[PDB]
């Protein structure tokens, strides 16, 4: 059956009986850094199965007024087992991911979520001159950011989903690795993305490579609204490797 899937990573296995295939970002499967592209000279540490496993973030509630949600990687995993520990004890890190978004309802529910993985999603601020988004706002952790809620401080980033929070039109996000969760067809989305950057490895703490953006393009509707419909995200690092070991970095 082409609508079933089982994904095994380390000691974790995820299943779905209503998928819409899977997407491999830019057609490139994640792989370890080769000696021809490498630059840092010390031997990397490769945690393997203790880090390349599915980590489930906090669930979100989807209702008729939801405007969307976003998370940044690797930030969202900063407190996730061994993977999290490794990104703070090392200067450099490198990794790919398997993002699995879950959301089921019923054959009497309707709604559509656009699930996108954006590389270098540099957020914007609105009507605030040259003041840019502050560090703590773009590093929410596993809780991510719920569009349309925050208390307006100055370094607060844009909350306009139709402008991709960056000055570009939502309808064109499909140019990035993506999938849709159309309740009448599937109850999950699966994106496998490789490491994408202009350098072979980077700081896991000051730089977020990917951003997971989930926008409900078609309002959630049904005749049984009291029944809460959550959205759950499970992310698994792939080929994670770290370099430049030292004491553990403490942020903020």
């Amino acid at each position: 059956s082409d609508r079933i899937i089982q994904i095994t990573r380390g000691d974790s296995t995820i299943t779905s009986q209503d998928v819409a295939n899977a997407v491999v970002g830019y057609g490139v499967w994640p792989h370890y850094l080769t000696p021809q592209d490498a630059t840092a000279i010390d031997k990397p540490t490769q945690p393997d199965t203790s880090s390349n496993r599915f980590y489930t973030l906090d669930s979100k509630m989807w209702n008729s007024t939801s405007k969307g949600w976003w998370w940044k990687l690797p930030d969202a995993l900063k407190d996730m087992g061994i993977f999290g520990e490794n990104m703070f004890y090392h200067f450099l890190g490198r990794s790919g991911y398997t993002v699995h978004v879950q959301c089921n309802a019923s054959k009497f529910h309707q709604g559509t979520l656009l699930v996108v993985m954006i590389p270098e999603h540099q957020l914007a601020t609105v009507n605030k001159g040259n003041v840019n988004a502050g560090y703590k706002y773009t590093h929410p952790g596993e809780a991510g950011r719920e569009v349309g809620t925050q208390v307006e401080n100055e370094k607060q980033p844009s909350d306009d989903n139709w402008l991709n929070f960056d000055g570009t039109l939502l309808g064109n996000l499909l140019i990035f690795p993506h999938q849709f969760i159309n309740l009448r067809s599937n109850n999950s989305a699966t994106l496998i993305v490789p490491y994408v950057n202009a350098v072979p490895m980077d700081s896991m703490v000051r730089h977020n490579n990917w951003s997971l953006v989930i926008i409900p393009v078609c309002q959630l509707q049904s005749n049984n609204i009291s029944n809460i419909v959550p959205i759950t995200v499970s992310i698994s690092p792939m080929c994670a490797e770290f370099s430049g070991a030292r004491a553990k970095t403490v942020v903020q």
Binding site: P119, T168, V205
Partner: protein, 285 residues
């Protein structure tokens, strides 16, 4: 044939588009027009699959749509002004923190990609306006000061000696100056966007300003003070060569505000801030 290769470049027929083949009426349970956009893939259906087509021999080529062609045209990136008003020593020289963020036209094109690697061709168009009548003999000096090198603070600063920095001297009446620059990043590609900081505190800087330091362009009128004041405006043009781009993205939809940031302004009536034109209704073409 490397000569057959050359004939194609002259005619611009290196990348040809496929032909349309004749198709026929069909009746089957294979329904190409049906699919699932949820998969994130575009339906690969072609015209031969939905209508009965004739055979057509395509002559179109994609050469002009190549990345090399798209980013390979000189556009303005800066307009330097040296306006002599009342103090020659202070007004005959200036400096500019180099970047490709100040002019919307070329900035938008490069920002249709996340990363890009290319060599640059800089062409300068200087124009001397005679505010009092004569222009005399204008000689200009444009000096590239890489980050770290000493920046001149007077028109006779020792830094103008240019013992190691690259300087281009232009004499009024001679052709427009021009030169090439190799890919300059300390990384493998330039960042068109950067979701990162130069630290981990509330006061750390965000964006490409962290990764795109290109140095300063210092210029001065070499000629010493003249009786008649002039206003010299030098316009800098940039063109990419031997280009490569990665991860395409949505085009900028609202006006730019500042350099190195995606920040934008929004008015009370947003439809005025985007190129989208309001439709009367769903059926009014």
């Amino acid at each position: 044939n490397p000569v057959e290769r050359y004939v194609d470049e002259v005619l611009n027929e290196v990348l040809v588009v496929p032909n349309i083949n004749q198709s026929h009426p069909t009746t089957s349970n294979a329904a190409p027009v049906l699919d699932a956009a949820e998969t994130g893939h575009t339906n690969k259906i072609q015209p031969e699959d939905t209508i009965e087509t004739r055979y057509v021999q395509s002559s179109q080529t994609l050469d002009e749509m190549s990345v090399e062609s798209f980013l390979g045209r000189s556009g303005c990136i800066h307009e330097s002004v040296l306006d002599i008003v009342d103090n020659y020593n202070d007004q005959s020289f200036t400096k500019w923190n180099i970047n490709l963020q100040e002019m919307a036209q070329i900035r938008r094109k490069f920002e249709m990609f996340t990363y890009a690697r290319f060599d640059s061709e800089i062409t300068m168009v200087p124009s001397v306006a005679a505010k009092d009548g004569h222009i005399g003999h204008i000689v200009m000096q444009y000096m590239y000061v890489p980050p770290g090198a000493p920046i001149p603070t007077t028109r006779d600063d020792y830094a103008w000696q240019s013992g190691t920095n690259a300087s281009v001297f232009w004499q009024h009446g001679q052709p427009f100056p021009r030169f090439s620059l190799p890919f300059l990043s300390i990384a493998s590609a330039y960042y068109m966007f950067y979701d990162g900081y130069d630290g981990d505190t509330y006061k750390s800087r965000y964006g490409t300003v962290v990764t795109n330091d290109m140095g300063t362009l210092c210029s001065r009128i070499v000629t010493s003070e003249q009786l008649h004041k002039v206003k010299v405006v030098t316009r800098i043009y940039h063109k990419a060569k031997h280009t490569k781009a990665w991860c395409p993205r949505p085009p900028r939809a609202v006006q730019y505000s500042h350099t190195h940031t995606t920040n934008y302004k929004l008015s009370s009536e947003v439809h005025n801030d985007v190129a989208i034109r309001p439709r009367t209704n769903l059926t009014t073409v």
